[PDB]
Amino acid sequence: APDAVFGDRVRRFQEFLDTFTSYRDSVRSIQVYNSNNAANYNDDQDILPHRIIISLDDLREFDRSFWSGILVEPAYFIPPAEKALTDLADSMDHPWKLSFKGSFGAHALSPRTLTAQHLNKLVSVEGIVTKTSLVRPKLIRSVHYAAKTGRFHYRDYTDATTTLTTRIPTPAIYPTEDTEGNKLTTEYGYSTFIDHQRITVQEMPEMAPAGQLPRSIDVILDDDLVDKTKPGDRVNVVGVFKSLGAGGMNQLIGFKTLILGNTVYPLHARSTGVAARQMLTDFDIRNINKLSKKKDIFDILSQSLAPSIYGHDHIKKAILLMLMGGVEKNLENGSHLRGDINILMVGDPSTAKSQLLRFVLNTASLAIATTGRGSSGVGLTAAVTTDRETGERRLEAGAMVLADRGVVCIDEFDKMTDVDRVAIHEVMEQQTVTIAKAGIHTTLNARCSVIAAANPVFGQYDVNRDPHQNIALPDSLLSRFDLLFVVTDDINEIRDRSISEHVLRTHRVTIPFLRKYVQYAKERVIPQLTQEAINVIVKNYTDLRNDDNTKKSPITARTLETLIRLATAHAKVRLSKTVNKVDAKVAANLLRFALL
Amino acid sequence: ALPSIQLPVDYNNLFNEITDFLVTFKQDKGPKYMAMLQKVANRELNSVIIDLDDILQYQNEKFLQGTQADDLVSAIQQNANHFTELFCRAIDNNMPLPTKEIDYKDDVLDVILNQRRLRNERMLSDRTNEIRSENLMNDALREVVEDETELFPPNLTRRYFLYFKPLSQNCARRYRKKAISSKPLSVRQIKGDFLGQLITVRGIITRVSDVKPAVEVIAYTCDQCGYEVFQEVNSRTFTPLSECTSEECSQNQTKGQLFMSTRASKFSAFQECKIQELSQQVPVGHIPRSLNIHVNGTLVRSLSPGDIVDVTGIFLPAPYTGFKALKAGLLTETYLEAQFVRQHKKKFASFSLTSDVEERVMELITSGDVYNRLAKSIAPEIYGNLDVKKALLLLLVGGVDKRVGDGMKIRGDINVCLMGDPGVAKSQLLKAICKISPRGVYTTGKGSSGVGLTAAVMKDPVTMILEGGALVLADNGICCIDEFDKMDESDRTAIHEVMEQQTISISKAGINTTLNARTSILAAANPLYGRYNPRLSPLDNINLPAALLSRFDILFLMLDIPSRDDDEKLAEHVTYVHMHNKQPDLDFTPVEPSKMREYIAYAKTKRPVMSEAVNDYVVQAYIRLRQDSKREMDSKFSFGQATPRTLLGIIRLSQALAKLRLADMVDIDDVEEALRLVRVSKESLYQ
DNA sequence: CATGCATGCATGCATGCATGCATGCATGCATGCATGCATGCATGCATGCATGCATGCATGCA
DNA sequence: TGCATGCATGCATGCATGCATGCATGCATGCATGCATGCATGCATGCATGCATGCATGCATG
């Protein structure tokens, strides 16, 4: 029987749980969906866990005492509130855990300065996920069959990790020969099991000082929380700092620590991981539906992406289209056909070449800036594991591996050696990377979009000598890149005037609306080619072979594959489902300025 | 582990309301108990008596005038042990302390507590000087002094005691409330569920122990750090403690070495006894049990053995089990703690109040014809024998004494024997006499031997004393004796040793005591085989020598002549007994014994003195007796010899006869009544 | 007098060796704790002594 | 000669006296066990020596 203390934490929180009805409809939708989830699985043929997000908002405006008690000694208020919450689950119609979401300036400190203070409290820690261990299940409930009596039995096992209170440990040996001497034949399947995982978290390098030895702690996960993180991200972790173990006083330092009762939140980096958690309201999409009913919004989106840069109209138009990415149609039992678009630009220095690059990085999603050399692990993983648990070989995902469904920013492309350029033919064309070293030959997938930037060989001689061999690049790399933009050094006065007041007003519709409009178009706007799309480009591509060869070079059928992608990405902008001839009229003009 | 339980019993507002009732009471000049507390502060009284009725009167009072009072009668009634000290620390809040300058001869206890009051304050005056002298409203400045100084506890200097008192049903008759604490309950009715309650039992005080001090707390002188260590013991046994437990002897290399002290310790009066069952509500085939009751403090030396008393108290266990192998694991041995004594048969020589007494005594006095009314009232349930009842009324008086000083006493005791058989129903009166009279033990012939009614030596329990007999018990009282004819011949010798007063000689194996006894003797033997032969003589039909008959001042004979006219009134007498439960009709009202004995006990404090004219009347009247007794000298119907002890009785009798006039008026009619009861007592064998 | 080719030299990185550094297995050595027994203390049962009483015998009386 | 009465004598019912019996308890002795030390083992990690790449030079070219 519980005491008076235990029920009072219940009834006070039950008073709060009756205070706000927003969480009532939450658990209602949990139960109805999982009922309907089992309803469709068991009627025609003849997943979700139990936790609800509670903010750290309302407890301050309800009970400042119950506010305070959690933030110091959480080991008294967490069990009865859950017991009261499992009461609500049983009354309105299994752990039924919680979140404790909420921002607080109390204990959001660095893990670097965490030790020996604020022990047995609840601390919010962020940092780097590294050296993720293996996923193991845990034994809980054993099932045994006795032969002659013909009945089953019952036996449980517990550990100190889950319970959060120091209870008297009672170990029990795994049973054999129980009562009279019948053999306890073991069974499985009905014996229950729950997965288990432990990981280490390094602190933030951007928060770190200049150079010192980093120090870290460990986090053990729970059943529905196993394996949400790959090693190498930025994740906020909210849990309770608990120290277990007999600290060396049995028979030189004990009291090793850990953090349990946890919730895991991956957060966006500058250049790592997902940023697609941005919501869309009905108020949001109604603005998009009001926006997409126009006739000239491609121009407005073109002029939008030069917030501080004069000119370069047709360059910006393609930068919309690469983030559209084209359509992907993998053939039936054949191969995929590549859909993304890769562009290199060239021009004289101090002409907004480096004023373009981070704008491509920050506006887009899942981008990696690759600068200078890319030696030994950018396109590769290098398989260097000396794992102390067992002699084996695993991988550490390189940047080209990591930038899948994304953008790779290549800076100073001409300074790259020929070594990694072998891999670029493999990456840009077959969309796969196969690594075959003596441990394990492998094969993986990476379909990144690529923008690189190279200089001329000597001087600013961009137009003087000849258009051929201003770069002196290998021949297939011409065929790898789709459009090759040449930026001139035109000296004028009217053009200088447009430079003049632009920079002067600089030092004295929007971007966050834009990426909502971008990521919405990915999952519902892919179009399909129509009959009108053939008749123009058949006439047009013959002109591309018959007369462009009298001016420049080369013309491959791979160029016609890009002609499909340009009309494809243009239909994504208008969010049409068919493909119009006007999309080709846009796409035909894009080759003329890029080349002639 | 170790959970908690909430219950509707509070300690907070109960302490608040109990402060108000301790202050605000006016009904029974100013406040009642503060004037009592000022009398406690007058340092002339040691007890504090708390009823339950003024509580219930206050609890009636608050609901009728104000909104709501917390219940406090049934609150105390449940647990009753925490209400001792939680009530008593509220007393020390308010006190008219300096109300009298101390007497030089007041109390050796008083001079010690006056020090510990003063040594507390002088130590308190030191610390408040240092803190204000080292600064960086004064309530916190007061509060710093509170916790930085070791003090004497307020439990250590009390000097008084508090006893509770159960409520009567009388006010509970007006308003029924939790009146469950006051019922005449039995030891058989004590179920083991009444633990901690406040109860009411009754029985017989049996095997009273001796009063010896019980050590409670022990002082310990440091002799190096100069502190005083105090150890409280609530167990049966304990131990002395280590070399020192000071704070200053601590954190230092050389600790002290202590020893206890006697004059600084606190003791307590301790004595216990056992209560036997009342032997009236016992089931039809059972043997009466006993019960242990501890007594502490003021109420000691107030319980004689062999009485009838109402004991009220609270029911607590003691940690004890029986044999080692018979222990089932949690065996609780109980007891009772005494709180209040109310005795049935209120003992004489213990009152001095007269005003409310004479509120009823004067109505007995102004009733008229009182002396004839009295012997009618003692055991009226037989017919006739009014002069026989009249002498027994005078046996109830006794109560005279004289020592010449450096000489001998005279015993003012009456020894009336009864002869006759069998249809007089003498034992109807023999049980009745020792019943009304306080200190009355009913005895038989053979059921006590020559060693039984005298003392004996046995090994003492927890506290080699001389365990006494019935005559040892029934001193300053009347012993009722059946069948003296069938005693032991050695048992006769002790009876002759009582006719000289206070003498019981013992020459046994290790005992040489001559113990004292203020007893009184009533005897009744039966005559010889057959009944009243005039051919048989006096002493012929008597089985005892006349030297024993010489020791008897007054003797009766119980004739039974079947007479025709005497029967019809006696027949109407006995048949009216079963028609009703009361004999007299329209001519007489009986005296209840409780009011009767109070008039007796007040008459016991008179001591009438004779005069000179009554000296002249008795002398020649003794020459009347001396002359005609010594003219027969035969074994005829007249008895042989006339003792001078006959004059010793009849002077003592008319002295005792003067006591029922309550006036010290020894007169001629005082002596005129005395001669009539002599000549009729003897020689009633004429018919 | 102004470029292109063959020739020779300087230098940074891949890795299969030597060596230091974490878990179990084993063995000798010294501290502490449960416990049966020699001892002492408390208690119940049985025999000789004092003796009132029932009984047999000596005695005088009708 | 028969009968009632007083006196001598055995009986077993309570007090001293002797001894056997049962229960509580502090201490000296034996045994399970933690702890220091070094080992065979298993596995991660630094390093130096020679080859392909970059640049200077002599020769040829036009």
Ligand SMILES: Nc1ncnc2c1ncn2[C@@H]1O[C@H](COP(=O)(O)OP(=O)(O)O)[C@@H](O)[C@H]1O
């Ligand atoms: N058309 C333009 N409008 C505004 N600023 C420009 C323009 N062209 C160049 N800039 C300036 O040139 C700088 C960027 O130089 P950039 O050409 O990006 O570097 P690099 O040629 O070395 O890659 C920016 O600070 C920007 O102010």
